[PDB]
């Protein structure tokens, strides 16, 4: 259009897009490779640097999304996209690409902050391309980078030993950050000011990166949105071997040894590993035999390269990256989106005590709560009322609190206590972009803040004046944090540091400061889990 940039491995050609209210068009570069494609023998291995190219690579097409269930993937991209229209993507193992939105005049001198987005989808689905960086980049003058990383089996297959350690997806995330360091100056970005941010499994990934020595000097601020390293559904402790064996059997491989399982899986076609994925029935709750065996996903493991010990132990040791860290959550993290996606046994308008307890047990993959604690937990949340419709609501508050609220505050506290500037928020607002099938009473569902962070009101239609102003404020807070490690700025509500007083920001129509986010839930669960 005609912007051409030279990266360490060769030239790329992007295009210009203008945003209303902004004279300088944003230069967009789609499908830049940050690694060699992880094919054949490179499956279940760390990413390798991309091979160099001659001439000018076209970076004007969205790349494929990493192999995943196309039905769940597209459904998630549709619900999370900040675009007027979702962009249908192709599936491939050839998926280690990133997309760049730089608002800089590349003919001129620039050294802008860089915000690197890591999408969610439970480490099983999701895509970079779902997220248009155009609005955030233009409104706040930051270079926005969206990254992809291997998912499901390809991303996280682990034998628990040196033949397939696992965490390939997080290695990709790290690879993308090294690429950013080595390249982003050519896109008008500052490699001394990188902010990583992510939502759900993306937030968990940011939290895990904060804890990993591999990610040292790769970023200078971090934001986890509705997900952290103590969101226990995404982090496998204990023996991963049974899972590995069930996958290899489902793939039609023998289990004689680890190295033999890995070699046999490496001979399978993309199509065969996808078939296997669909038969494992991940992102779904198994209603058979034991909840303690049911696997809704595989995910982060303690591999000895990325993570040396469990997040719990690493926090106590305080060896992690003490960068400024914003950790936040939404008011009803389990209000609609997540249960709808797993076809959760939620159906009736109400719910009694005894079902609650068996549901919670079958929910073990999500909440990771032993059977002896289940009566107490349910009584705690559901016992103060005989009203079965309010039982249902308290129950979703329960799951939300265990999955996100409590882990988040714990992470934030530990990060504060290590000596790092820490911020927290709780987001409470119901976007007009919400799916029509979500009840109007669900407010601050999982993902609801995305529309503000990415500026859906500037790209989709139908936004009120209130919704518009809400996005402008969220983006300015996010980018102020990227600039300064501190979201505050003149014109914005005061956001207190998450210090000994535990100030945090209630973000929504009426944005204001408060204190001790989830204090009583944290005490309750912690005391209960140490029984």
Author numbering: 22 to 552
Copied sentences from the primary study:
To provide a definitive insight into the importance of N-glycosylation on the structure and activity of human hCES1, the crystal structure of the enzyme with the mutation, N79Q, has been determined. The structure-function relationship of this aglycosylated hCES1 was explored alongside the wild type enzyme and a catalytically inactive mutant (S221A). The yields of the aglycosylated hCES1 N79Q, glycosylated hCES1 and S221A enzymes were 39 mg/L, 64 mg/L and 68 mg/L respectively showing that N-glycosylation is not required for expression and secretion of the enzyme consistent with previous results. As expected, the mobility of the N79Q protein was not altered by PNGase treatment. Activity increased linearly with enzyme concentration and the specific activities for hCES1 and for hCES1 N79Q were 73 µmol min-1 μg-1, 98 µmol min-1 μg-1 respectively. A comparison of authentically glycosylated human hCES1 produced in HEK cells with an aglycosylated version of the enzyme shows that preventing glycosylation at N79 does not affect the synthesis, activity or structure of the enzyme.
They are defined by their ability to hydrolyze ester, amide, or thioester bonds to their corresponding alcohol, amine or thiol and free acid in a diverse range of chemically distinct compounds. Carboxylesterases comprise three distinct domains; a central domain containing the catalytic triad (S221, H467 and E354), a regulatory domain (RD) and an α/β domain. The active site occupies a 10-15Å deep hydrophobic pocket at the interface of the three domains with all three catalytic residues arranged such that a proton transfer chain can be established.
